[PDB]
Write a protein that binds this DNA or RNA. Sequence first.
RNA 1: CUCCGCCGGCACCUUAUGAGAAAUCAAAGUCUUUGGGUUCCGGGGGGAGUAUGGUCGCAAGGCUGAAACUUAAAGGAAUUGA
Lengths: 119, 70, 128, 76, 214, 202, 95
Amino acid sequence: GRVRTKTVKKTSRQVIEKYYSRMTLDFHTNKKVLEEVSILQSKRLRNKVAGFTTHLMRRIQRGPVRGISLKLQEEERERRMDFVPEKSALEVDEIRVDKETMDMLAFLGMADLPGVERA
Amino acid sequence: ELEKLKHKKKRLVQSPNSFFMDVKCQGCFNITTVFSHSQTVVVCPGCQTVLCQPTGGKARLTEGCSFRRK
Amino acid sequence: GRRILNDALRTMVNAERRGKATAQLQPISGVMISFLNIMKHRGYIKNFEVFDPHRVGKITVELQGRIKDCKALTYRQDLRATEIEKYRTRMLPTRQWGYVVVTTPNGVLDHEEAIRQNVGGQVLGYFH
Amino acid sequence: MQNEVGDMVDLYVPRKCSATNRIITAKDHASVQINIGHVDENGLYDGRFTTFALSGFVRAQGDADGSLDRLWQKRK
Amino acid sequence: KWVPVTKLGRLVKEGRFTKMEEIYLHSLPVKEHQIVETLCPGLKDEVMKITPVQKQTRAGQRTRFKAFVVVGDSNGHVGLGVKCAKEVATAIRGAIILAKLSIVPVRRGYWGNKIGLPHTVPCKVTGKCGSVTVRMVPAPRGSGIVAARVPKKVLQFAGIDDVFTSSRGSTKTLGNFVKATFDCLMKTYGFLTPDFWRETTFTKAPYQEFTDIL
Amino acid sequence: RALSQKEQDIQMMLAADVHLGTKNCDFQMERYAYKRRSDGIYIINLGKTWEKLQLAARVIVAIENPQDIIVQSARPYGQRAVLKFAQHTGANAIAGRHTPGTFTNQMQTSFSEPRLLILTDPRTDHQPIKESALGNIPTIAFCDTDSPMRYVDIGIPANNKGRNSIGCLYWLLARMVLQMRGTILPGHKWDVMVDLFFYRDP
Amino acid sequence: TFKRRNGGRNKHGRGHVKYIRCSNCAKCCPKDKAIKRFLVRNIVEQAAVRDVQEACVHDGYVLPKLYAKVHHCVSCAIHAHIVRVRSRENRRNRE
RNA sequence: CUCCGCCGGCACCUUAUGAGAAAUCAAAGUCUUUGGGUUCCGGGGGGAGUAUGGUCGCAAGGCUGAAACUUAAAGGAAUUGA
Ligand SMILES: [Mg+2]
Ligand SMILES: [Mg+2]
Ligand SMILES: [Mg+2]
Ligand SMILES: [Mg+2]
Ligand SMILES: [Mg+2]
Ligand SMILES: [Mg+2]
Ligand SMILES: [Mg+2]
Ligand SMILES: [Mg+2]
Ligand SMILES: [Zn+2]
């Protein structure tokens, strides 16, 4: 019956985004932190939102996470993605192709070509 | 091409798939004209050996029958 | 079960509607050829080529994408050069383009030539 | 089209499909017009291109691709 | 005011078109009725029919009013709008906007002798919607529009002065009947006449012409 | 003598398995299938692949404002490939699921009026093909031997199921465009390594 | 309205197909229209397989299986839930 | 037994650029842009496949087959609800 609704879920993601490093694992510190980054109208709702920022930040601290875009996480996925090996692993030293592939190469006029050999 | 693939009459110009062929046996080195789709058992007149076997398609040559289309 | 010049003209319309480059007409005849000459001199088809392996014979036509419809009027009426006008209106898209081909004792020709030469005849088809 | 006085009376002479000669009308939103760039020499581009129009009929058929290929095979 | 959201609406707002025919030439879809209402100055709308349709609900039946609006200037442009909404006035408002978006060009011809202003449809043309089919035949100058009330209204907005009409099917379904006339008038540019046989000279579209502005 | 640009390309495409078609051949794709193997898998004519890349390149370069071209991939293999391809031509990259309505719906937050659309596979990227058919948007697609070629203007015959093939094609395509624009001089040395385009599995 | 394209049975090129008797009610239905399941069952459910292999004198006796081909009419097939009313869209799945 | 091709069959699947009131249909497509050939047959719903005459049959019945009168709908496909 304690399914967290949209407001608690949406605010919880959004509040982490603006303030990630400033948060922690303590529910009560998170309750207090949440107190001075927003204006709310009920303390029951505050604990619900702080309740959905506390363990959510375990699963963030554990692994990746949905729509919430963490800068320290999202830069470093990009930084590691913009990567190349010590040279092109697509190498053309040995291209072993079937006869009917060579037949195509012949039809193109390229029966003799670097590194192509029948099997 | 593919005109050799289309049906005998569906070709641009009709042409028969069949042909005529010269067959030599071993017991009589004579030369015999036969039809690729014979329908008749043909014995070379010399040695009297049977030379073709009719079926629902091309005539069947047997053991010892070299042939050449002509 | 054949009545040609329907098979020929319907093949061209079906080829044209799809947008093909050439059409093949398996049975051909002098009547069918004379109809294509009339179409061609008026500008609705390109050239075409007869095939003689022997037989009725085949013809391949090259289409230029600007024939809209061509039909045969089987049950070929007799057509005085006086009711040309009534068959013109019923069967043609307007009074500006389109031709009715009529076979007449001065040859196969379109209804325009028929008026100039003052001959009636028997209707074969039309194109536009 | 032309008045027999001289004036031209159509508004909007339409485009025609370059593959089938069909008229391309005002609401044929599947129709496309392609500009194929001309490469000339060192550098390999200036603002010269060839324009072809394709009917929405041709693209729906699937032979849009084959028509462009067979249309781009023209030499000049 | 406007604040356009499409490339074409933007280009129209800077004042870089004169008429709908540049848009018609390249078959751009018109998604903002502001475009047509500046380009066609003398555009006249009209409600022909207001129809109530109903769906059954456990509580009862919820009526809805569907409006048919014909718009157009009487020199070659018409549009047709239909829209169903809970209130008649708002049904018509949506109908006007849908009609103006649908404006199409209508070509004309002469009956026999290409003299003066073109007055009829050029040639025989037919359109079909549902079971109803409408035929239009060229007529000698000054035959009037001999047609039923519904198609006659559409043709006066199209600027056609004379035409012979026929019909088939259930013309009493005014929805299909008005719409099939619009199909008939739409496709009068569909017909490849000998006078259109010449190779077409292409021009860059607006999305390629005003690239730098975009 | 040495190898021409075409031959270095054929060598690279032949290294990326781009020639390997699937088991079926669509009747529209048959004009490129060179032959069929005893295994039954067709072989794509790498010769024809090259000019379609050139044909695609001439269409791309005549687009004066690249931000007005869109490139897409439904499958996960083409994600990194098309993202980098856009980074280098200036195009607009839309990777992942396509929001239905982004070309037709003018009030949608995501919305566009592209002049050209490049798709990784018509079979998996069907929805943008269907949408471009409503907006006079021409289409460029990499078509395998069984890609349905409806509403596809330029279909490059090529393997579009492979990790190496997809990235190889886009790298090879992006090269040809940059040459025509002049940002890269004559002389095939383009120091952007081809492995950049193949995606990385985390 | 024509609910199905096959008419409810597999019959092409044929004129007449011999009927069969429903297992449940013995209503006659043609062999190509009946619901035909080949049932492969055990003489005993796994509740009583060990305490019947404890009694087999000869080691290695595998318990035989009852083989049957059971026929049903449409009403008996529906009522027993061997086949269900499917959606219009799912009516066309033959797997 | 495996692969490829042709011809002729019973069908099936996917799709319109097609048609249709639609369900659907690759034949129910190539129809107001209406003409390949030919046979049978319908003209709102009932009365009625009835009466009567003929004719075929052992019979049961078959084939041919009205009218008086009556009536605003009957009917088809699909939609929302119940
Ligand atoms: Mg029922
Ligand atoms: Mg049989
Ligand atoms: Mg029977
Ligand atoms: Mg077969
Ligand atoms: Mg009647
Ligand atoms: Mg009656
Ligand atoms: Mg009934
Ligand atoms: Mg009913
Ligand atoms: Zn039963």
